[PDB]
Design a protein around this nucleic acid. Structure first.
Ligand SMILES: [Mg+2]
Ligand SMILES: [Mg+2]
Ligand SMILES: [Mg+2]
Ligand SMILES: [Mg+2]
Ligand SMILES: [Mg+2]
Ligand SMILES: [Mg+2]
Ligand SMILES: [Mg+2]
Ligand SMILES: [Mg+2]
Ligand SMILES: [Mg+2]
Ligand SMILES: [Mg+2]
Ligand SMILES: [Mg+2]
Ligand SMILES: [Mg+2]
Ligand SMILES: [Mg+2]
Ligand SMILES: [Mg+2]
Ligand SMILES: [Mg+2]
Ligand SMILES: [Mg+2]
Ligand SMILES: [Mg+2]
Ligand SMILES: [Mg+2]
Ligand SMILES: [Mg+2]
Ligand SMILES: [Mg+2]
Ligand SMILES: [Mg+2]
Ligand SMILES: [Mg+2]
Ligand SMILES: [Mg+2]
Ligand SMILES: [Mg+2]
Ligand SMILES: [Mg+2]
Ligand SMILES: [Mg+2]
Ligand SMILES: [Mg+2]
Ligand SMILES: [Mg+2]
Ligand SMILES: [Mg+2]
Ligand SMILES: [Mg+2]
Ligand SMILES: [Mg+2]
Ligand SMILES: [Mg+2]
Ligand SMILES: [Mg+2]
Ligand SMILES: [Mg+2]
Ligand SMILES: [Mg+2]
Ligand SMILES: [Mg+2]
Ligand SMILES: [Mg+2]
Ligand SMILES: [Mg+2]
Ligand SMILES: [Mg+2]
Ligand SMILES: [Mg+2]
Ligand SMILES: [Mg+2]
Ligand SMILES: [Mg+2]
Ligand SMILES: [Mg+2]
Ligand SMILES: [Mg+2]
Ligand SMILES: [Mg+2]
Ligand SMILES: [Mg+2]
Ligand SMILES: [Mg+2]
Ligand SMILES: [Mg+2]
Ligand SMILES: [Mg+2]
Ligand SMILES: [Mg+2]
Ligand SMILES: [Mg+2]
Ligand SMILES: [Mg+2]
Ligand SMILES: [Mg+2]
Ligand SMILES: [Mg+2]
Ligand SMILES: [Mg+2]
Ligand SMILES: [Mg+2]
Ligand SMILES: [Mg+2]
Ligand SMILES: [Mg+2]
Ligand SMILES: [Mg+2]
Ligand SMILES: [Mg+2]
Ligand SMILES: [Mg+2]
Length: 245
RNA sequence: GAGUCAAACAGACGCGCAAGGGAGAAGAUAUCAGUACUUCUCUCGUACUGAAAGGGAGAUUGUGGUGUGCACACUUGCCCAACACCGACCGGCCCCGGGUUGAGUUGGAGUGUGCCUGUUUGGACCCGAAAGGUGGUGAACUAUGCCUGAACAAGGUGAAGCCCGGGGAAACUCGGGUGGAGGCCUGUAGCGAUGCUGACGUGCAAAUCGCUCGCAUGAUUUGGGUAUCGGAGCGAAAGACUCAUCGAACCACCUAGUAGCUGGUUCACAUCGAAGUUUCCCUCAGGAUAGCUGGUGCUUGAAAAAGUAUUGUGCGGUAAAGCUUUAAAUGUGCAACUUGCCAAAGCAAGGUAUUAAGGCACCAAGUGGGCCUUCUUCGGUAAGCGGAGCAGGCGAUGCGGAAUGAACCGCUUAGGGAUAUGUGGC
RNA sequence: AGCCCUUCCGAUGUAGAUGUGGCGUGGAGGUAAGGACGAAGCUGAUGGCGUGAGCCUCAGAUGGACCAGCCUCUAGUGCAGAUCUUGGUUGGCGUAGCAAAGAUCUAACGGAACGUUGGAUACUGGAGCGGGGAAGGAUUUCGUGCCAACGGCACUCGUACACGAGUUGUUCGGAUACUGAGCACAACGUUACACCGUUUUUAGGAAAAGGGGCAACAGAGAACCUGGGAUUAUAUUCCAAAAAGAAAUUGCAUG
RNA sequence: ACUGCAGACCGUACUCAUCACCGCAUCAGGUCCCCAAGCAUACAAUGCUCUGGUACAUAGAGAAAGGUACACUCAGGGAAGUCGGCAAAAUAGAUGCGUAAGUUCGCAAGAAGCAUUGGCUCUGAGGGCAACAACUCAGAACUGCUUACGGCGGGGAAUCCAACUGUAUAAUUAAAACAUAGGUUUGUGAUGCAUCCAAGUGGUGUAUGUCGCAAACUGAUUUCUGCCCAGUGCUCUGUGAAGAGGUUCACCGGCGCGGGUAAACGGCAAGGUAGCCAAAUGCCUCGUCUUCCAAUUAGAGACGCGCAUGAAUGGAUUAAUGAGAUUCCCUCUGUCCCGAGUUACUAUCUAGCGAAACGACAGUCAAGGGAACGGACUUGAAGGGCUAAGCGGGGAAAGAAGACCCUGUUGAGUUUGACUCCAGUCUGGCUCUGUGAGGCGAGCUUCACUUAUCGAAUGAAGAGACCAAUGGGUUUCGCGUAGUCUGCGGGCUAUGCACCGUCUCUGAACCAACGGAGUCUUGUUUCGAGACAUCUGCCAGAUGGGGAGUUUGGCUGGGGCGGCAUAUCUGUUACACGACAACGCAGGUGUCCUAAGGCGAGCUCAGUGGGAUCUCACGUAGAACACAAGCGUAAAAGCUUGCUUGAUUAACGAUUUCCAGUACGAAUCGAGACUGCGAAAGCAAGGCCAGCGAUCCUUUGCGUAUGAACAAAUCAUACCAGAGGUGUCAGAAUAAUUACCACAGGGAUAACUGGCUUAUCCUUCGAUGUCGGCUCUUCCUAACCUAGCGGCUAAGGGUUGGAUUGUUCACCCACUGACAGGGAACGUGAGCUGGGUUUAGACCGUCGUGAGACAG
RNA sequence: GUGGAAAUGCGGCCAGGUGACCAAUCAAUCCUCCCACGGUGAGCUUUCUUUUCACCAUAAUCCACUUGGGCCUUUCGAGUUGUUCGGAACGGGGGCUCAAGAUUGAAAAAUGCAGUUGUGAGUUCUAUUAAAGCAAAAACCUGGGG
């Protein structure tokens, strides 16, 4: 045959993220001693658009814990995070929007964003716009809170894990129809060479497992096995069910 | 410019020695990669057989016998070679003296070499694929992404916001302007490229020209830079594009790849001269096999002569006949003392017409599409049709004749002359 | 070229086989011989010989120095045909054409005979057959001469030929001296192997917190302007003391 | 401030283009940037002009046919032309009016449609700055028109498709395809998902984090997406024993079932729902009806026995959009009737210059024959030679070893539930792998531990302790208690002392004023997991077109399709020895039988007839003899019956058939043994004749041999004799597809082309352009009209224009005296046209698992 | 260091700024173009033509010093062609300051040219889509602190 496009994206050549104009990683502050035994006040300096990203990123400027210099630092913004706002990261941070305080100290039922799964990893869950995760339980005896991932998905993480308070900003992007082929041209301009998506049945038999034939049709089930070798694992992958739900 | 070189076999022919032949590597010497010389070995052979352990051939001072058998001898002998038949014997295998088996033996024929031919393999007579592999080179064309720049006349329509007004209980509508929106419109530039299926079409051009046309504020066009490629890259996806190369680039190499296929294969003359059929083959465009043919002989000379009769003796079941049976013609075959059986020594067996050189061996080629016709048929509605039988032809062959004709007719053929003819004519 | 004679029979022939004191070629061992009184080669109404391949002789008003015979050895040995290879030549044929973008005319001169100037006439028509640059080219530039060849006609002319010239910078651009998409040295790791990968390195990277470098002649950066009577050809580069001049700017130093 | 000195490197010419670059060139092609006048004008359109540049594109003379054109004009008609309004014409600027359906309310729209427009002399309007400037609009008279630059939309009504803009086969396809938004679905919480890499503390999505990413399908909106989970897919649920040992046997170690899923593949297990249609999907078929016309294979609209519609393999419907398909209309026209005239450049003739293709040889015909359509031959008929311009009939003209087709034990691309595999994935075991506490069972798991390992974070930036032990022992090294031990020095277990050990709704901040700022360390940077694995390595199993290599028999009146005539038997073909062919003809064959074999004996049968299964007669085989057929057979070879195993062994006996005089099979004559039957001779080593098979290997038997230093046992091997099988039957182990295709050939072999016949395969595959039309000529006559007769003669001349459809053909409308049939390579493509056929693109239906196929 | 009530005027590290990022439009200059005037040269000139054409130039550098914006201060309107704005300070008076610009002059008439200004137009430069938000960095600057 010939290499499938799903496999070629793994070369990550043409298919790499753009990101020249990206501001850098949008993370939480390094889990300092100050985070673990107090709090760091950083004022939000400016809320930026990172191209290719939905959520605005904030520019909180924490003062450096150990030296005379000030440490501007960039994290995806919770909604209502205005410039000049004083963020408070740390274990005994007050419970407010934008504050980053230990997950086990956040009240059960309150919704948090930019949650970190592993302790100290600097915020990986609930980072996309509009996204958040409600804390659904604490377990102080074993120090592991549960939380509901932005997908209907429960997950247990240590309470020492940081989280930010509130919904991530920029929510509701997806609600607006794109309408133009050109409009989606630009949302992916800042993302990657993801787009346009040619259908595999429109492709040739060399190009794709679905490709080829006179009427353009898949010839075999589109629901591929989990163990299917790459270049084969196209169509619906390890699908448990198909059909509209 | 195209059967070569090597090598391994084989037959034939030449040479050497011969129950042996020969060296090779190497050496030693004398004088020049030669010639001369030789040890020691090795090698093929003289012994074969069996899977193997193993065993291993003379007869009753000499052909094992017998049959047919040159020459010579003598008036039949001996028979050479040779064939055949039979022993015995060696090995192996058995049976209960017998069978049988070997590429055995039976007074060695091998060997080295030259040379030709044949087989094989190698580039393999020469030339030719589509490919396969190995490794490199390419994103200047072009595909895509990114960086960073550049570009886009003149109109048109006229969105949101805004502003003024009229109406309304309110409700928020109706004028009018404003404004300049849009993968908006017309249309430059630019980017394309629909149509004329226009020009051109050995062109200006290995894709161009003309007019027409499409997009032309956008998913636009464009420079530079940069990233991604060959079982790979890139693709709004046409298997498109990846330097005029893409259903797998280009370069080099393996590689003179392979070809049962196509094409070619170079002096003369003389001597003979086919086959297109048999069996077998993943065989059907090819082989192997046998036949046909050549060469070499060998062997001896009405030997085992015969595409023919006659005579004698078989065979037959087609035509005709007949109502599935009698039976042609053309054919077809053939001929010219010792030791079993018996009751026993008698039987059995082995022994004291025309014409014409016969047989045998070896090696080898081409061929293995046939065609026509005669007669006979089979299939087909029929055919310049498919299939067979017979014989003859053409193929491979003219010549004479049928005006003409591959195969009809006559006749078949060295270079010529006379004569006379053949078919055909006058 | 059969030792001679006599008689008899045969004679075609594709594929193929075979024969041949058969032909012929390059070379070798021999022999014999030839050649500047002309070898080979080549030419040939030069005949002669041979069935033939061919040989021989003659003649060159050809050549200029090698070489035939014979026996033996050898082979890269004989060609009308391979859409054969290579070179040359040919018919077609002085033909097909040299018809896209409107265009020249005149006189004078030049010249051995198209140019030059004047005039006339048009054209381009500022998205130009204009004036500068990138890429690319790299002497094409300029002058003199030349026009053999080339400029598909012609040339007296040329981007052609030959000869001689020509490109001037504190400030232009570039580098010195930015970063960018990116790249990759180092180290480290992987690999049978570094010609791989990350791009910082399980890592002690300071020599007086995160190694070194590169990557934009359109991005960032960037101190200079005009006048010239200054060239055949360069000028924001040349100019000379009244620098035509006027500046800005960097370094050091100086009062 | 000044002044003084110094200010280095390289670039620098020219070009930047119908002659300087790329394109083999001074090539009409291509190639980034900058500056860019005047007038008309809305203008960078277009025309023209100053400046700057050109006058270089070979020229001349003249003005045959035919051409090219970025040239026109054409009476009357007006699409009749054609496949098709192709091409041309036509519309056109501005202003004022006016503007339909339909619609997503934006549009449609420049809809459509009328109307006015010049010149001139005037008027009006519209501003600025203080105490002169535009130039548009408007109006008015008067007057003019030859309707007189350039430039500038033709319009409308419908159907199909796609929603739209877009993209896209560079060099035949710009589409209806791709994209698209929108829709759905799948995976997935980072230990991830997809995925690159040979490999790694490697890489991509991911600079990310479910409003994300990765994978698919559908394809805007509106509307709807029915039924089917049966298939398929996806998903989910080492240890013992024997043995001397090799070894062998045994025990434990992801599937099956079951469930779910169709916006999975698909069907309509379910039986096609809503819809929609002779639709790009309907064979029949030009369906039928209606509408459109004079006429309609067209169209539109209905209808629905739908060959073979139908629902995200999306259904339907859709305004806007469209160089999309299609029908009609108005306008318009040289498309046409039916051509004519003009132009300019060609051609023509000249000066200069100067190829190519092609080239066997040539080159008048008719007939003939012939490789079956001759330029060479036979026989006739022509023909003096050489020319110039045309021309396109022939030269089966040239072009290219036919892209078609077939063949080849040739390719490649694709597919796959072909064969063989290989990565990937997952699973398992082991390993990595330590330590404590358990329990269970005869080293397994729970549970903690932590130093391996793993993950994470970090610029390794603050861990634990001091709060004190089922803790430590080198300045703490030591004591005391009980138990035991002793190398007499102490040890060890328990244990307690000590000691290790101890302190408290954006401002600014640093560069310290022994400490200030705690000390300590059986160390780990921290955090998490943790002997698990997000770990290593190795084996294992499954999966695995993701990829790879390979194959995908033959024959065959081409191939495929089947058949199999691919091995064998009978009758026939077959022609009175033997042999003899055809996808020739009629049948058979792979078996079957302990008996249906062997033997003996007895017997007689099929059927007919006479009587009542029987009885008698006759009874030439008319029956039976496994099996098709032939043969043969009567006290039998049949039938019953009895006894039986000769259907054994058979020393390698020889032979026949096939034949090559090889084999296999089959069979015949034998010999030896031992039998069987029979009084006996005799008969029997199967059932006559078809019923079956190498090498290698496996296996079984049998009677010694080898395992080569020796020996025995095991094992293995060997000899020898059977068996397992190659049915393609003298024996590879083998799926499709290609219209994207390719090569070597083939006229050995199709379509095609002539011939023959009424299909053959003769020519042609190093190529002879297809149907049709148009155009033009010509010939025939089984005469349609005309003419003469009375159906016959008669080939003379003529035989129409249209609608539908590519057509031919047919059918229609109209005319006509009539609208005849044919030949000429189904006349005529270096004459055209290119509608049909029509390669690649694409769509639909059906077929196919798929790639792909369909003479739809 | 220093003036000013103020806006502000003059004389290591750390943080910020410049670099630095938009189509258009509007405005100013620039430039080109036109016109008017005036000069100068040339040309037409049968006739006509107070005429037609050309030219009338002003470099960087420096020195003194109207439009747009920001700000200081003082005591419903404001605003644009345009989608604004105002007690978080609108308007008015005075002031500050930036950005362009004008004029005064130095350059510089010793140049250019050849035998003048002004006026009009154009050009020039200095929001929208956005699920698009439209580079970096050295250099350099200024500060805070020392
Ligand atoms: Mg496709
Ligand atoms: Mg595939
Ligand atoms: Mg589809
Ligand atoms: Mg489909
Ligand atoms: Mg021997
Ligand atoms: Mg060869
Ligand atoms: Mg050979
Ligand atoms: Mg080759
Ligand atoms: Mg291969
Ligand atoms: Mg547009
Ligand atoms: Mg248009
Ligand atoms: Mg395709
Ligand atoms: Mg003969
Ligand atoms: Mg052949
Ligand atoms: Mg008979
Ligand atoms: Mg008869
Ligand atoms: Mg004759
Ligand atoms: Mg002869
Ligand atoms: Mg030689
Ligand atoms: Mg002559
Ligand atoms: Mg040779
Ligand atoms: Mg000519
Ligand atoms: Mg002009
Ligand atoms: Mg020059
Ligand atoms: Mg030169
Ligand atoms: Mg970088
Ligand atoms: Mg650099
Ligand atoms: Mg620059
Ligand atoms: Mg510079
Ligand atoms: Mg110059
Ligand atoms: Mg220059
Ligand atoms: Mg230029
Ligand atoms: Mg213009
Ligand atoms: Mg123009
Ligand atoms: Mg007319
Ligand atoms: Mg018409
Ligand atoms: Mg018509
Ligand atoms: Mg017609
Ligand atoms: Mg047209
Ligand atoms: Mg309406
Ligand atoms: Mg479309
Ligand atoms: Mg194309
Ligand atoms: Mg589509
Ligand atoms: Mg939809
Ligand atoms: Mg459905
Ligand atoms: Mg209809
Ligand atoms: Mg369907
Ligand atoms: Mg379009
Ligand atoms: Mg061929
Ligand atoms: Mg074959
Ligand atoms: Mg092969
Ligand atoms: Mg017979
Ligand atoms: Mg009997
Ligand atoms: Mg035998
Ligand atoms: Mg046998
Ligand atoms: Mg039998
Ligand atoms: Mg066979
Ligand atoms: Mg044939
Ligand atoms: Mg025809
Ligand atoms: Mg023709
Ligand atoms: Mg100045």
């Amino acid at each position: 045959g010939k290499t499938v496009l799903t496999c070629r994206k793994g070369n990550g050549s043409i298919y790499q993220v753009h990101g020249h104009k990206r501001l850098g990683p949008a993370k939480l502050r390094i889990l300092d001693y100050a985070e673990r035994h107090g709090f760091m006040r950083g004022v939000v300096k400016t809320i930026e658009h990172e191209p290719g990203r939905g959520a605005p990123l904030a520019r909180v400027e924490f003062r450096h814990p150990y030296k005379y210099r000030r440490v501007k630092e960039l994290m995806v913004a919770p909604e209502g995070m205005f410039t000049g706002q004083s963020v408070l990261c740390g274990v005994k941070a007050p419970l407010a929007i934008g504050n980053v305080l230990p997950l086990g100290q956040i009240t059960e039922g309150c919704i948090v964003c930019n949650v970190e799964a592993k302790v100290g990893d600097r915020g990986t869950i609930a980072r996309a716009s509009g996204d958040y995760c409600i804390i659904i339980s604490h377990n102080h005896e074993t120090g592991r809170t549960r939380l509901k991932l932005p997908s209907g998905q429960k997950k247990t993480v240590p309470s020492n894990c940081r989280a930010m308070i509130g919904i991530i900003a920029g929510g509701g992007r997806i609600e607006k129809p794109v309408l133009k082929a050109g409009n989606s041209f630009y949302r992916f301009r800042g993302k990657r060479n993801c787009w346009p998506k040619v259908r595999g049945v429109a492709r040739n038999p060399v190009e794709h497992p679905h490709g080829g034939g006179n009427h353009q049709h898949i010839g075999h089930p589109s629901t591929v096995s989990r163990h299917a070798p790459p270049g084969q694992k196209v169509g619906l992958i390890a699908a448990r069910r198909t059909g509209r739900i």
